Design a protein around this ligand. Structure first.
Ligand SMILES: CCCCC[C@H](CC(=O)NO)C(=O)N[C@H](C(=O)N1CCC[C@H]1CO)C(C)C
Ligand SMILES: [Co+2]
Length: 205
């Protein structure tokens, strides 16, 4: 299967492993992962985290021809399992200094689930992109401004976390993937940049 090839020790995930719009796997509902976590799944998660790290390494990304990404879900690499990886980076300050800490959030979540959320919604002012989608769909991708997520880490320990801002946006984008949902599904087709008081607009800069 695909996962088998992906977990090969010397295998590096590249755009060649990312299925695109059209493959039915993107629209399927990923299956939960068995507990305790089996080797295959844990290794896949690490491969996913490593992919993200490589994508955010300007030289490496440039060498491998990768698109900088801040998250990835198993289905995107043709594995219909509820496994997602997030790597949300901090940005430089107003003065131009590099962030004190490269990442704001780094985690591989297994069987993640949204338990509660804010009444307010939120969308990145610049819209969203997806490496599984080879085209641009402009508009505000409407998501919950804040969410509480329950998931199991690679150790197999259950966690419950409160996310907001950029972290909340990224996690929902990834969770959408394991439910067969693509970002443009959350863009108001009749008015892509529709706004409402309850809709917070996030500027990353
Ligand atoms: C924001 C919600 C999470 C996005 C995750 C995607 C990666 C992905 O395809 N996950 O499934 C990404 O990094 N997309 C990028 C993206 O949309 N970004 C990167 C910075 C913030 C935002 C731009 O508005 C594009 C540039 C490839
Ligand atoms: Co995506």
């Amino acid at each position: 299967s695909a996962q088998d090839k992906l977990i090969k020790p010397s295998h590096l995930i590249t755009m060649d492993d990312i299925i695109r719009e059209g493959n039915p796997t993107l629209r399927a509902v990923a299956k939960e992962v068995s507990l305790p976590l089996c080797d295959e799944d844990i290794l896949l998660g690490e491969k996913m985290m490593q992919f993200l790290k490589h994508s955010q390494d300007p030289v490496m990304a440039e060498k491998l021809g990768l698109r900088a990404g801040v998250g990835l879900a198993a289905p995107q690499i043709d594995v219909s399992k509820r496994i997602i990886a997030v790597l949300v980076p901090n940005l430089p300050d107003k003065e131009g200094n590099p962030p004190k800490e490269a990442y704001s959030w780094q985690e591989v979540l297994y069987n993640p689930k949204i338990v509660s959320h804010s009444v307010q919604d939120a969308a990145l002012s610049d819209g969203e992109g997806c490496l599984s989608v080879d085209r641009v769909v402009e508009g505000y991708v409407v998501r919950h401004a804040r969410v509480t997520v329950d998931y199991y880490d690679k150790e197999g320990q259950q966690h419950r976390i409160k996310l907001k801002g950029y972290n909340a946006i990224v996690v929902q984008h990834e969770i959408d993937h394991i439910n067969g949902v693509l970002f443009y599904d959350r863009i108001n087709a009749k008015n892509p940049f529709e706004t409402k008081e309850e809709l917070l607009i996030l500027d990353l800069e």
